[PDB]
Amino acid sequence: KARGNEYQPSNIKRKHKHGWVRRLRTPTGVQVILRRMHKGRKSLSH
Amino acid sequence: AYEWGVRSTRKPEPPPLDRVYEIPGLEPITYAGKMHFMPGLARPVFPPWDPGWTHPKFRRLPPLHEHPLYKDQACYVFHQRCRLLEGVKQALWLTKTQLIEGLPEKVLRLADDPRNHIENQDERVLNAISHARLWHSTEDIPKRETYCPVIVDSLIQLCKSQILKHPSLARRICAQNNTLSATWNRESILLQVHGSSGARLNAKDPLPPVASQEEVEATKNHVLETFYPISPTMGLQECNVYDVNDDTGFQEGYPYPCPHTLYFLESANLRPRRFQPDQLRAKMILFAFGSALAQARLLYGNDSKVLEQPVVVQSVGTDGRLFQFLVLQLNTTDLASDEGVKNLAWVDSDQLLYQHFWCLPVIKKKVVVEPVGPIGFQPETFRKFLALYLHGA
Amino acid sequence: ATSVSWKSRTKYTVMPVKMRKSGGRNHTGQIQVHGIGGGHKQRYRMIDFLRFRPEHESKPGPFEEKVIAVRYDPCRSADIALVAGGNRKRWIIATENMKAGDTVLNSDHIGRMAVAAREGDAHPLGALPVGTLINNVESEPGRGAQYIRAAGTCGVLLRKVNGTAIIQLPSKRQMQVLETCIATVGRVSNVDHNKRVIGKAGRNRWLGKRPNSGLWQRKGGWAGRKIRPLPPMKSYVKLP
Amino acid sequence: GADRMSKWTSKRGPRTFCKGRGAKGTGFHGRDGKFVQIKEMIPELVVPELAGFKLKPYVNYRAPEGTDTPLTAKQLFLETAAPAIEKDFKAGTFDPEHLEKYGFEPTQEGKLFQLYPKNFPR
RNA sequence: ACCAAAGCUAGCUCAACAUACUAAACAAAUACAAAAAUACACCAAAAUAAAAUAAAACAUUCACCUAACAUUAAAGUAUAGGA
RNA sequence: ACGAGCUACCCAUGAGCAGUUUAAAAGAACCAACUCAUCUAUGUGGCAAAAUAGUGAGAAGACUUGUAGGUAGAGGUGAAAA
RNA sequence: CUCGCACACGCUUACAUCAGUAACUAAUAAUAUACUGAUAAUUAACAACCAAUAAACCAAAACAACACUAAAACGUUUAUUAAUUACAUUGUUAACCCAACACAGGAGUGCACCAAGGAAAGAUUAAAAGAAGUAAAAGGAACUCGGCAAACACAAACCCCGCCUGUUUACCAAAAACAUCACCUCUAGCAUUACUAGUAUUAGAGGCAAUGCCUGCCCAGUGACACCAGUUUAACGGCCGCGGUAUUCUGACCGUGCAAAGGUAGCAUAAUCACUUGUUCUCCAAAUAAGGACUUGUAUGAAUGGCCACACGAGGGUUUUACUGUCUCUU
Numbered sequence A: 001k002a003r004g005n006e007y008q009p010s011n012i013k014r015k016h017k018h019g020w021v022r023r024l025r026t027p028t029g030v031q032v033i034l035r036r037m038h039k040g041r042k043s044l045s046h
Numbered sequence B: 001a002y003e004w005g006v007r008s009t010r011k012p013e014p015p016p017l018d019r020v021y022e023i024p025g026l027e028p029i030t031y032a033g034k035m036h037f038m039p040g041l042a043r044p045v046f047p048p049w050d051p052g053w054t055h056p057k058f059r060r061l062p063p064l065h066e067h068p069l070y071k072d073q074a075c076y077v078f079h080q081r082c083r084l085l086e087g088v089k090q091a092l093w094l095t096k097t098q099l100i101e102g103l104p105e106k107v108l109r110l111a112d113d114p115r116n117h118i119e120n121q122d123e124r125v126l127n128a129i130s131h132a133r134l135w136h137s138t139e140d141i142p143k144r145e146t147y148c149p150v151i152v153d154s155l156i157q158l159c160k161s162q163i164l165k166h167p168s169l170a171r172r173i174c175a176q177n178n179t180l181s182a183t184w185n186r187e188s189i190l191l192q193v194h195g196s197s198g199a200r201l202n203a204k205d206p207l208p209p210v211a212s213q214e215e216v217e218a219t220k221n222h223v224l225e226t227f228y229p230i231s232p233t234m235g236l237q238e239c240n241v242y243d244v245n246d247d248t249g250f251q252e253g254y255p256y257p258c259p260h261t262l263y264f265l266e267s268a269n270l271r272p273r274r275f276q277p278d279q280l281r282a283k284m285i286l287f288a289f290g291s292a293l294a295q296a297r298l299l300y301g302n303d304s305k306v307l308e309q310p311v312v313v314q315s316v317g318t319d320g321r322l323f324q325f326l327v328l329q330l331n332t333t334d335l336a337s338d339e340g341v342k343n344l345a346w347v348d349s350d351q352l353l354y355q356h357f358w359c360l361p362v363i364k365k366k367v368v369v370e371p372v373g374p375i376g377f378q379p380e381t382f383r384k385f386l387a388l389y390l391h392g393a
Numbered sequence C: 001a002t003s004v005s006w007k008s009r010t011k012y013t014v015m016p017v018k019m020r021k022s023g024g025r026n027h028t029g030q031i032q033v034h035g036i037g038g039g040h041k042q043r044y045r046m047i048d049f050l051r052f053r054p055e056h057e058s059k060p061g062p063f064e065e066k067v068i069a070v071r072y073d074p075c076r077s078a079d080i081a082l083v084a085g086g087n088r089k090r091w092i093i094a095t096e097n098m099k100a101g102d103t104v105l106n107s108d109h110i111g112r113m114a115v116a117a118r119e120g121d122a123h124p125l126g127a128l129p130v131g132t133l134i135n136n137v138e139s140e141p142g143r144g145a146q147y148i149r150a151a152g153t154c155g156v157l158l159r160k161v162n163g164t165a166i167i168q169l170p171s172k173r174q175m176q177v178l179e180t181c182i183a184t185v186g187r188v189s190n191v192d193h194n195k196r197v198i199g200k201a202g203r204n205r206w207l208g209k210r211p212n213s214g215l216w217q218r219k220g221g222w223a224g225r226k227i228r229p230l231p232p233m234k235s236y237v238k239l240p
Numbered sequence D: 001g002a003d004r005m006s007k008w009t010s011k012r013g014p015r016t017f018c019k020g021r022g023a024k025g026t027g028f029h030g031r032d033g034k035f036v037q038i039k040e041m042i043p044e045l046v047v048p049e050l051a052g053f054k055l056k057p058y059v060n061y062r063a064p065e066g067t068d069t070p071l072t073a074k075q076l077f078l079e080t081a082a083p084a085i086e087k088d089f090k091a092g093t094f095d096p097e098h099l100e101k102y103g104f105e106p107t108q109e110g111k112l113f114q115l116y117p118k119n120f121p122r
Numbered sequence E: 001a002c003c004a005a006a007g008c009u010a011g012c013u014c015a016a017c018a019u020a021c022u023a024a025a026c027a028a029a030u031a032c033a034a035a036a037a038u039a040c041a042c043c044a045a046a047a048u049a050a051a052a053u054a055a056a057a058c059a060u061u062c063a064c065c066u067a068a069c070a071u072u073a074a075a076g077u078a079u080a081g082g083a
Numbered sequence F: 001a002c003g004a005g006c007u008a009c010c011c012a013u014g015a016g017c018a019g020u021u022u023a024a025a026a027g028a029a030c031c032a033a034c035u036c037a038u039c040u041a042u043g044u045g046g047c048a049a050a051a052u053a054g055u056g057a058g059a060a061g062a063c064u065u066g067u068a069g070g071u072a073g074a075g076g077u078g079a080a081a082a
Numbered sequence G: 001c002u003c004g005c006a007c008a009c010g011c012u013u014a015c016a017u018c019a020g021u022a023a024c025u026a027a028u029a030a031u032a033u034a035c036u037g038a039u040a041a042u043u044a045a046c047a048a049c050c051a052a053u054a055a056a057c058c059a060a061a062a063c064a065a066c067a068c069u070a071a072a073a074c075g076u077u078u079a080u081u082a083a084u085u086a087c088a089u090u091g092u093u094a095a096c097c098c099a100a101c102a103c104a105g106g107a108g109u110g111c112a113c114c115a116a117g118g119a120a121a122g123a124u125u126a127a128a129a130g131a132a133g134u135a136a137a138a139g140g141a142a143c144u145c146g147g148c149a150a151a152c153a154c155a156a157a158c159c160c161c162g163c164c165u166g167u168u169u170a171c172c173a174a175a176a177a178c179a180u181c182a183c184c185u186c187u188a189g190c191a192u193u194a195c196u197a198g199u200a201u202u203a204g205a206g207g208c209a210a211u212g213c214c215u216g217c218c219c220a221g222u223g224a225c226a227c228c229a230g231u232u233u234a235a236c237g238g239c240c241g242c243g244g245u246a247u248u249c250u251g252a253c254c255g256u257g258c259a260a261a262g263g264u265a266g267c268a269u270a271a272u273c274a275c276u277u278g279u280u281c282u283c284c285a286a287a288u289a290a291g292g293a294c295u296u297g298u299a300u301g302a303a304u305g306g307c308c309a310c311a312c313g314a315g316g317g318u319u320u321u322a323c324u325g326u327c328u329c330u331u
């Protein structure tokens, strides 16, 4: 009833949803890594 | 029929081989040269992996028939955790015994005499029950695996204190988790009692025979009960690897070669885990026979014959609230035939030591109806317990 | 993400096996059947449908077994009974008045004259009398019992012509089957399962049924009392 | 949120996540769960005797330097194996088939310390 | 009188030439929850681009819009279009 | 392409419900922890992009709750409030 | 004055010692758990990491003796193998996390309610207005849409709509809406991922809402089935005019026409177009309110359900009793 705190931290969830391993398991995920490497991002993924 | 496998759950079959392998006289091009997967190249076929030097942990399990003791004949093994459906009937059939209700007259007349009672027998046992179920643990409600061995050991100490009045109980000593094996042939099928026991009591001198010769002769005409739909083997473990050698728990020259009492404990929190009272009495019948059979063959020989000097082995089963008592005498070794002399076994079933115990005081309508302590007490159950312990002396 | 079905056990065992609910979700993860989920946890008993199954192939003759106990099975609407014979035990569906300490005969020998129909015996449809109530119907020889297993459901044999039996299913539909198929005589246990009354909405949730959706759908042309002639007899006999 | 541009180490995750900081394993897990430490896998440090050894970590300032000549595989051969080969060929005892007497080794797996696999750490 | 004002470098843009085109760094660790030496495997995949818009609406149609090998002309010609 | 760490529902694995009234652990009753949010007053760039104070309904169940997994936009989910 | 210690999850040195704060951070000052510089620190017994196959075993947790229905997490032993070899690696601080903030918000478990943890007022004056709290003469709802709020009150009864517990528009509607036990219609004779490890007393697609008394007539049209005639309304839907007639009134009856049948039982000025403040009786000194009757409602009406009742309700309306600054009238 008081929104604003939708982010409840969790390392297990964060590394399973946005982790480096998951990014390389789907063909669409690899394209996300390729786009961020081309743009020059400091951190490709979590 | 309806096979219990499921296609999805079962391991998938290997993928079909590439068409190149089907062409005679054509070497396929595989990616095994670059030792990594590459699309467009045929999948290699490798010979089974052959480690030059065998490694203990990481090698495949050897086949069962590779064991030197593997034998074609199927031997049936009865360990501690084997359940028998017709517990009293199957144990009687496999052992060739005759069930006699009530403890023997030597045992029963050994406890009714007031000259064989510990000081404050009623009070001390009442303290033993309370100590076992409520006092021995910091928790309010001790679990069964804690108070099942405590109550048995506490009662052993009570009857151990009688050594001062009878200075012959010092000939006894206890043994733990010994390996026992006894194999015998019973009507063209091979049975073997193998495993361990909870607690074992051994004495230097053998236990005297308890059955009169009139009862032994009356045992010849007794006919073993039979059950057609259920085979006597049901409930045992069929083992193709075994050794035909009656091995007791002790080597030669043991100063306590005569077992006296076996203590079987059914300690488990869950109801389905524990043996039923009918099945528990079956467990005592076979193990008490296995110990008796080991002596009957070690002291006389492997030849099968009727024993002129019987061997008596006792055993007590405990649930924590309900007790089982068994006295078994062994008279026959040649168990192949069913027409000779049978054995004898006296069993007291469901000797209730106490009805119920209240760890916390029950409160109904703001008043106390039943205080803390056991409800109902039958001293005769402990009195029979004391009788078996003093049977040798 | 693809899930794995809990039906992974390969060896038959009388003891209850662990069970995982689905909730109407297929292997993909989407709802396919609505109104299922949130039930009480249950264990599954391995039920042996094939009544005639010898312990060994050395002696293919008829065998007789003994009933130990009759229990309640959460999965099916009937009551199952533990049956032991030889060196194995089996969970089979108990008939109307099967009790403990009873003997059940399983046989397949098709005799010319007849065989007396008992309340628990399983005999091929070729040896049963014409007016016999049957359940656990085997559609094809060796396939196993598939039909008539619910509580209180019993089919009645009609006639045997040119070495082929015709039975009446509980849906009042005639079915043709080879006379060598094994069937069980009697009515399935728990006769008053139909007369059971659910006292509250919560008891439906305990069984595992979720409430229906609240969308108001106007009735179409499918509704209304439809009177339709009985469909023709279903025959599993392959005519050469 | 969380910092995605820091080092992911064992101190950040839950109790389940325990990642080593770079040490080399020295054993495995036994029957009872007690760590069975293999004696062989422990790196046995080998030290000489420096008591009778006369040398210091610093060199005198007046000591002259030398022309920096990196060691070459050709110079090493001309220093060690060439004199033995040259004398044998002049005496007629050279054998092109077998060169094991000059220090050449056909297969490395026979010896204790290979070269191409780089068996020894240091 | 405060706040402020002024500077000309950093580098960039568009081409041309041009080698012929994923740089620099890789001692160790990097697709277990990347940067964590070390165990009986499964591994992998393709299906015409659509529409915003123009026809003052919008249904057939709407250049360029992935793949042309260029320039001066033939020529905005022959043809294709709810023509 | 990326999102079910909030929320709707479900699959796993765990954890809570003291006293009081009744042959009752009966989707019973009184009342806390706990969970919802009826009525009114402050607040309205506020303590708060939905709260505080008083008062209320349930409180052994179709109940609350932690961890983790599943369903993704022509869809998911829904005791239909579009 | 009282939300205190610890673990899990999360944050990541913000913790500790010493020194400095003109300025930066604290919404101010002192000052330092929160700003700056230097130095230092969390030591494993607790916690993470921590064998495989074959076989025997139908028998619940609730003090569990023994039972209930919704049928239930929780394993031992025997056999065959398992590198055997002190000291491995990793988490140990905190005044902390998610909400733009050093935010009156959100936050799981164990044990206490304290032995532990904290400070409502920066200094004055004591105007109006506003917020919160206490008390009051005589009267006790005369206030007002309503007894909203407040109260030394903490009771009694009638009616309407839903049977009931439950659920929903996170952030203007918590209800008479949805669900629900019950009843009924409809579609299906059956195997390896849903339904289901099930088999018509089963399982889906829906309607209507317990119980009790009932659920009338109509296949012409449409739809469905049959896929032909035809069959189906607890399928979508429908369920009548004109004229005359017993002194008068009313209209049992009669003439005539059209339809697939012409609204049957019940209830009724209702939550039911308008007429409408229908008429009458009871309640009040006074009644567009409320209850009970009369009743063509020409637009009520029978599972798009009619009607009656117990229990229930932070729903909507009315009455009595008791209380009170709601109000006469404010202090």
Ligand SMILES: [K+]
Pocket: C072, C073, C074, C075, C076, C077, C078, C079
């Ligand atoms: K059932």
Ligand SMILES: [K+]
Pocket: F004
């Ligand atoms: K998820």
Ligand SMILES: [K+]
Pocket: F047, F048, G103, G104, G105
């Ligand atoms: K706040």
Ligand SMILES: [K+]
Pocket: G011, G012, G014, G096
């Ligand atoms: K922090």
Ligand SMILES: [K+]
Pocket: G145
């Ligand atoms: K009014």
Ligand SMILES: [K+]
Pocket: G174
């Ligand atoms: K409500």
Ligand SMILES: [K+]
Pocket: G219
């Ligand atoms: K019709």
Ligand SMILES: [K+]
Pocket: none
């Ligand atoms: K009225």
Ligand SMILES: [K+]
Pocket: G313, G315
């Ligand atoms: K309500």
Ligand SMILES: [Mg+2]
Pocket: A004, A006
């Ligand atoms: Mg946000």
Ligand SMILES: [Mg+2]
Pocket: A008
């Ligand atoms: Mg959460």
Ligand SMILES: [Mg+2]
Pocket: C074, C075, C208
């Ligand atoms: Mg089910």
Ligand SMILES: [Mg+2]
Pocket: C212
């Ligand atoms: Mg329904």
Ligand SMILES: [Mg+2]
Pocket: C213, C214, C215, C216
């Ligand atoms: Mg509905």
Ligand SMILES: [Mg+2]
Pocket: D001, D002
């Ligand atoms: Mg960020």
Ligand SMILES: [Mg+2]
Pocket: D010, D011, D012, D013, D014, D015, D016, D017, D018, G091
């Ligand atoms: Mg961690």
